[PDB]
């Protein structure tokens, strides 16, 4: 099925977003830009683990 993952901001903040992904069809990591409330810009967010 789809497994819960965690997107950690590339800035120094500890802010993160949560989503799910199909780890069988798409094994490679996600590199997406999302708004970071602490620093107040859009920055690269990188996939990590939820556990």
């Amino acid at each position: 099925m789809r497994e819960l993952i965690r997107l950690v901001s590339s800035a120094g903040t500890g802010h993160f977003y949560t989503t799910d992904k199909n780890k069988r069809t798409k094994p490679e990591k996600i590199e997406i830009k999302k708004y970071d409330p602490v620093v107040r810009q859009h920055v690269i967010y990188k996939e990590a683990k939820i556990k």
Binding site: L4, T18, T19, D20
Partner: protein, 63 residues
């Protein structure tokens, strides 16, 4: 003897001048599948409903 307050009711409701405060439910876990708007609107504090005041006040020994 003195009336005994319910311990679990006093940990969930606080007495203010506008009524009784409490937090919202459905916010402990299973949060990923929830809309951000829905989680944002369950974040603050709400006053007790009109039809629930009588039962809670009796539990708190306020009436």
């Amino acid at each position: 003897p003195k009336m005994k307050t319910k311990s679990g009711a006093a940990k969930r409701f606080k007495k203010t001048a506008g009524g009784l405060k409490h937090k919202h439910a459905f916010k402990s876990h299973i949060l990923t599948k929830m809309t951000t708007k829905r989680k944002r609107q369950l974040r603050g504090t709400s006053m007790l409903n009109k039809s629930d005041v009588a039962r809670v006040e009796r539990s708190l020994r306020l009436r």
